Design a binder for these strands. Structure first.
Ligand SMILES: [Mg+2]
Ligand SMILES: [Mg+2]
Ligand SMILES: [Mg+2]
Ligand SMILES: [Mg+2]
Ligand SMILES: [Mg+2]
Ligand SMILES: [Mg+2]
Ligand SMILES: [Mg+2]
Ligand SMILES: [Mg+2]
Ligand SMILES: [Mg+2]
Ligand SMILES: [Mg+2]
Ligand SMILES: [Mg+2]
Ligand SMILES: [Mg+2]
Ligand SMILES: [Mg+2]
Ligand SMILES: [Mg+2]
Ligand SMILES: [Mg+2]
Ligand SMILES: [Mg+2]
Ligand SMILES: [Mg+2]
Ligand SMILES: [Mg+2]
Ligand SMILES: [Mg+2]
Ligand SMILES: [Mg+2]
Lengths: 99, 127, 83, 208, 151, 116, 100
RNA sequence: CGGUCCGGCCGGGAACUCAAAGGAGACUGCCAGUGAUAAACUGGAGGAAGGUGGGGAUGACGUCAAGUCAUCAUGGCCCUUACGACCAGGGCUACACACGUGCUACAAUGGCGCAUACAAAGAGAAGCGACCUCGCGAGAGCAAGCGGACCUCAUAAAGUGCGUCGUAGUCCGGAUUGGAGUCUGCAACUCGACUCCAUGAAGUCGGAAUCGCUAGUAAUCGUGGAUCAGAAUGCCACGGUG
């Protein structure tokens, strides 16, 4: 089996990649587990927006790091190598865990 | 034959399962007197089953997570009302009047910038 | 304070100057910017002019001045009073 | 000290980021330095080219710089001459293999950075600021903008008292979140000081 | 406020007796959000109160509350060059709130050790119609009829 | 009720009335009563005089009122005689441990000294 | 910031990466309880003999664009100002104004 | 359900909680009355939510020649063998005093001791650092697991149950100071934090004066993060009771 972890910032582009790899391993391999969604990391930030002196004047930003977990139960040979050779857009970081 | 309801509160989440029986209350594999060391929470978890007269009528299996003592008691009441309306549905006309079916949406307010709390401003001085 | 397992602390150039004045047997005042060096028992009887930021104040070394550092005997802020 | 940046406020709704990559905290600020140095280099080299938006994207440890420009003929030159000159220095800066694509800017009168740099270049060659603001508005409303606002600031005509001026034609709703407000800002370094130029362009509301 | 008279929020009754008023008393007694302690103090004081009186705990609470409920308070108006203390009839909600507030303040000010001893002694004195809480009720009525010309 | 020179109140418990001794605290008083085998909930009343003699021997194990005050005065006058920074702070009446003297040095400096 | 302060930060990074293995060798000796005390004393005198700029605690994380010693953020390598300018122009991926 | 070392633990199951992604939902939409048949308002009906449901972001033309040439940029002026650059030490922490903002208190709605219950939200590779051992202790050693819904920080405290003190400058309060130490770091004298033993100031609710807050609010209780080798009672966030 292959655990696949997708880390991204845009959830539409990660759901685009997860459904892409599902239809891929659905055609080639067998028993795609599911696009199980994980909790989203929210790395917040808070900065002073004034150059010199305003302690109360601030912006509060964040970065939402969207996680997706997709498992492949029976890896064929073309399932593994042809899906590893298949690549997705940037912003998505894929991370395979074979077994 | 068990009848289910989810109750929620500040940050609590109760899972109530109703079976007909004698009135045995089990919360997280514990008795109500063991679990809530508080008579106000012992009242609010018995309030709808004394609104109707069904304390002795039915047994119940309860799990609850998150929150505190009054939070878990509020979600247990809201789960019990959700499940008694699943049991009968003729009781919604009374539990609405009792204010029980309404989920209390009073979350805590976030701390804001400049303010030491949600609304407390720091101490002011002209000079 | 420092851990005992690290022992005391002293500059190497100070410990060499102490070793020199010991072997030479000279009682010249050793001027030193090492305000952070712990005094050793072999330093007893020496005039060491500790820096203070502005000049070098001479410190005669006593028995009781062993377990301290040289900076304790060189005050850096001069204060006499306001009135 | 009042107004939010309309791009940064529209970045989740109708505007895209100019850098779309992912990294962990170890290689984040290093990628972001490499992006800063390449936007710096490309702006200095293509200063005469009317470049608007340098989009950076890096898949699989390979940088891809998409330059949006009004004319690609001066950016390319001969077929793979100047693009390749800029590509080998991009790969020198980023330390990874590079790839340069060029997206043409249709209607350069409807792009805030191009209008602001045309005004800045005009002020640098000493034209009247009101004439430059007039021609930017008339050209944009002719080319089809639903609303333009321009604004200059400071040391106008060599006057010692710095003041601000602004023109507006059409509706420019900044508080409307789904409004496609193209906003950008240039600076003219005259002999009397620094003249700041801001330009808002409202094309219309995205109905997502 | 300027615009509206408000709609008050609903209070729970107490678990022991079902009384709304006793839970309003434990909220007035409660400091720092510690309701559990003030509920224990009230249930201990009404325990010794019915021990000292043989009545219901609810009945002797209402008796001590009755002998401290004010009927007319005063308020500053100052329409002339100085302050006029004008009387006014007190509605039964504020009558009950001022009573329980005055009882709590006296039980804070007594010199007994336990809070339940200050509150049971103050309620038993209020039922005997003496103590500082009824003396505050008297001094309020006395300034009322000493200012009854203003209306 | 008379240990190490001074008297000791009888109505208090054992650890507290021991802590009346200048040189012991609640810790060392527990170490004393543990070495004497005496329970802590008892008073100085209803103690055997053999128990009080064991207590006197256990207190005599440590350094106390006159010895301890002599040692403290010796350490301070050692810093006084050296003329270190801690000695100068001890004889200027200023705080030793590196606290602020611009504000809030009132424990070492006493009450306020008005500008005359 | 100044040019010389930037030059000091670069010099303190080059020396902190140069002597990094030797300082950990000496600190392994000094921190080792199972060692000769004359060896630990010679090691701590060698560590005095090394330059002061070899320590990682000596150098300060300045802003990578301006050298600003205050307001630094480790994830972006920038101060809070150039963070706000980059987040507003959208040069920082996935970074936007939050509200909750 | 079947099975157990009684631990979802283990076969399993997918309902439930939850995790996200998408969608529905509330619109004066309906009923009645008022109104100038208008706008609209009041009420109740249902409904999880009712009139802006709650909170946030969002700050018009301009004002104060407000603030910042020390984030940066920049016109002009000045220095250029010094107003530039390098190093050590010192200082920015001083101290007759005055003010602001905070923390801890003056206790019995409490200090104590023992036992025990319930959180959310975060951070982690030059990092978080179990378990076990040693130390009263801060910590040390060996050392798994973890780029992390898995592992770690990390046992929430207030609370509850029993006993205790019994109105005292106290078993309140913890300042100050002495001694012994740990850790970080080339290095803790000036000038770090923390621990242990001892020490046990003032203070018994605060003059004139003055501040915040309208509901999950104030009040109170703990938790986490940024910065950071180390160094917060500040700041920014989180939930508990209420
Ligand atoms: Mg402030
Ligand atoms: Mg004031
Ligand atoms: Mg604003
Ligand atoms: Mg003592
Ligand atoms: Mg510069
Ligand atoms: Mg530093
Ligand atoms: Mg409705
Ligand atoms: Mg000015
Ligand atoms: Mg100024
Ligand atoms: Mg200046
Ligand atoms: Mg220096
Ligand atoms: Mg300062
Ligand atoms: Mg104490
Ligand atoms: Mg307790
Ligand atoms: Mg007790
Ligand atoms: Mg006194
Ligand atoms: Mg007292
Ligand atoms: Mg730190
Ligand atoms: Mg940190
Ligand atoms: Mg809170």
């Amino acid at each position: 089996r292959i655990r696949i972890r997708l880390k991204a910032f845009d959830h539409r582009l990660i759901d685009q990649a997860t459904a892409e790899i599902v239809e891929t391993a659905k055609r080639t391999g067998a028993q795609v587990r599911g696009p199980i969604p994980l909790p989203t990391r929210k790395e917040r930030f808070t900065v002073l927006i004034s150059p010199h002196v305003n302690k109360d004047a601030r912006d509060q930003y964040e970065i939402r790091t969207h996680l997706r977990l997709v498992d492949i139960v029976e890896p064929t040979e073309k399932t593994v190598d042809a899906l590893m050779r298949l690549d997705l857009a940037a912003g998505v970081d894929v991370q395979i865990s074979l077994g | 034959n068990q009848y289910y309801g989810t109750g929620r509160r500040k940050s609590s989440a109760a899972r109530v399962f109703i079976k007909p029986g004698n009135g045995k209350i089990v919360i997280n594999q514990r008795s109500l007197e063991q679990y809530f060391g508080r008579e106000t929470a012992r009242m609010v978890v018995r309030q709808p089953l004394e609104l109707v007269d069904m304390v002795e009528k039915l047994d119940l299996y309860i799990t609850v997570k998150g929150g505190g003592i009054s939070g878990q008691a509020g979600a247990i009441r809201h789960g019990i009302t959700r499940a008694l309306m699943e049991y009968d549905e003729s009781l919604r006309s009374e539990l609405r009047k009792a204010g029980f079916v309404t989920r209390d949406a009073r979350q805590v307010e976030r701390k804001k910038v400049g303010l030491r709390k949600a609304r407390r401003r720091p101490q002011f001085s002209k000079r | 304070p420092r851990s005992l397992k690290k022992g005391p602390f002293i500059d190497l150039h100070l410990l060499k100057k102490v070793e020199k004045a010991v072997e030479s047997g000279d009682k010249k005042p050793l001027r030193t910017w090492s305000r952070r060096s712990t005094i050793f028992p072999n330093m007893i009887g020496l005039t060491i002019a500790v820096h203070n930021g502005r000049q070098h104040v001479p410190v005669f070394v006593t028995d009781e001045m062993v377990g301290h550092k040289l900076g304790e005997f060189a005050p850096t802020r001069t204060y006499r009073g306001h009135a | 000290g009042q107004k939010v940046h309309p791009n940064g406020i529209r970045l989740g709704i109708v505007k895209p980021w100019n850098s779309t990559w992912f990294a962990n905290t170890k290689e984040f600020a290093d990628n972001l330095d490499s992006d800063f140095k390449v936007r710096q280099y490309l702006t200095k080299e293509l200063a005469k080219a009317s470049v608007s938006r340098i989009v950076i994207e890096r898949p699989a440890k390979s940088i891809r710089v998409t330059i949006h420009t009004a004319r690609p003929g001066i950016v390319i030159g001969k077929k793979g001459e100047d693009v390749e000159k800029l590509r080998k220095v991009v790969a020198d800066i980023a330390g990874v293999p590079a790839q340069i694509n060029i997206a043409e800017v249709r209607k350069p009168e409807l792009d805030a950075k191009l209008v602001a740099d045309s005004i800045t270049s005009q002020l640098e060659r000493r034209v009247m600021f009101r004439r430059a603001m007039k021609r930017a508005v008339q050209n944009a409303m002719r080319l089809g903008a639903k609303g333009i606002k321009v604004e200059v600031s400071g040391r106008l005509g060599g006057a010692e008292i710095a003041r601000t001026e602004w023109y507006r034609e059409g509706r420019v709703p900044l508080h409307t979140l789904r409004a496609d407000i193209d906003y950008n800002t240039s600076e003219a370094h005259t002999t009397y000081g620094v003249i700041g130029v801001k330009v808002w362009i409202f094309k219309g509301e995205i109905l997502g | 406020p300027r615009r509206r008279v408000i709609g008050q929020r609903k209070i729970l009754p107490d678990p022991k007796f079902g009384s709304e008023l006793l839970a309003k008393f434990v909220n007035i007694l409660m400091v720092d959000g510690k309701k559990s302690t003030a509920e224990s103090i009230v249930y201990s004081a009404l325990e010794t109160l019915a021990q000292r009186s043989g009545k219901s705990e609810l009945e002797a609470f209402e008796v001590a509350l009755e002998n401290v409920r004010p009927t007319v308070e005063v308020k500053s108006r100052r329409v002339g060059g100085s302050t006029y203390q004008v009387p006014v009839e007190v509605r039964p909600v504020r009558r009950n709130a001022l009573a329980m507030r005055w009882i709590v303040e006296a039980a804070r000010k007594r010199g007994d050790k336990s809070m339940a001893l200050r509150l049971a002694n103050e309620l038993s004195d209020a039922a005997e119609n003496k103590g500082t809480a009824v003396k505050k009720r008297e001094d309020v009525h006395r300034m009322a009829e000493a200012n009854k010309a203003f209306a | 009720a008379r240990i190490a020179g001074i008297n000791i109140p009888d109505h208090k418990h054992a650890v507290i009335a021991l802590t009346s001794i200048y040189g012991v605290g609640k810790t060392r008083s527990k170490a004393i009563l543990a070495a004497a085998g005496i329970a802590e909930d008892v008073k100085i009343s209803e103690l055997s005089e053999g128990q009080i003699d064991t207590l006197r021997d256990e207190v005599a194990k440590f350094v106390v009122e006159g010895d301890l005050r002599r040692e403290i005065s010796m350490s301070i006058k050692r810093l006084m005689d050296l003329g270190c920074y801690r000695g100068l702070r001890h004889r200027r009446g200023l705080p030793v441990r590196g606290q602020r003297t611009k504000t809030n040095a009132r424990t070492r400096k006493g009450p306020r000294k008005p500008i005359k | 910031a100044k040019q010389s302060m930037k030059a000091r930060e670069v010099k303190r990074v080059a020396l902190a990466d140069k002597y990094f293995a030797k300082r950990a060798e000496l600190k392994a000796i000094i921190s080792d309880v199972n060692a000769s005390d004359e060896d630990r004393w010679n090691a701590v005198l060698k560590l005095q003999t090394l330059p002061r700029d070899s320590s990682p605690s000596r150098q300060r994380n300045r802003c990578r664009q301006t050298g600003r010693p205050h307001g630094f953020l480790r994830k972006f390598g920038l101060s809070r100002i150039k963070v706000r300018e980059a987040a507003m122009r959208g040069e920082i991926p996935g970074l936007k104004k939050a509200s909750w």
